[PDB]
């Protein structure tokens with residue numbers, strides 16, 4: 434994964450948001466990419482955002498799951514986003530409906546109009562993980578097909594499995 438972002442994009446404009454419930458595995462993925470200097474920001478208290486930047490590829494990572502006063506500021510980070518990576522704990526069935534509701538509250542925002550969506554069915558390396566097609570039905574991702582390029586990619590963050598495919602896919606669909 435060392436540098437793979439660089440040889441893939443080579444400083445095209447690419448502003449990625451990577452979100453999901455806590456425990457889904459985002460920070461693991463962020464660090465696997467070896468993207469460069471992480472900058473852990475607190476735009477306001479109760480809102481921990483971690484941003485990395487390489488050439489022209491920007492990442493911004495935070496956990497969903499509450500604290501409404503910081504949502505007008507979520508929308509500030511939405512503006513100009515070129516791709517949303519939404520990470521899901523595939524092995525946590527009783528939290529899938531939570532994760533579903535938070536995904537739809539983000540992806541249908543007007544500031545994310547037509548935004549590309551990769552749903553990472555992460556922790557597929559745990560017994561009992563839901564399959565991508567299962568997650569598609571549970572999440573009713575068909576409702577987003579009219580206006581969002583989307584894919585569900587099975588990943589194993591701690592291995593890096595699926596992460597190269599994820600970046601290649603985003604790249605193939607971008608300017």
Ligand SMILES: Nc1nc2c(ncn2[C@@H]2O[C@H](COP(=O)(O)OP(=O)(O)O)[C@@H](OP(=O)(O)O)[C@H]2O)c(=O)[nH]1
Pocket residue numbers: 453454455456457458459460461462496520555556557558559588589590591592
């Ligand atoms: N089986 C499996 N486990 C994963 C995977 N990705 C992350 N885990 C683990 O799940 C926990 C959540 O990781 P983290 O990146 O902090 O989630 P978050 O940033 O979305 O809150 C981590 O363990 P710890 O917090 O204990 O260090 C992490 O090592 C995966 O792909 N497969």
Ligand SMILES: [Mg+2]
Pocket residue numbers: 459460461
């Ligand atoms: Mg984290």
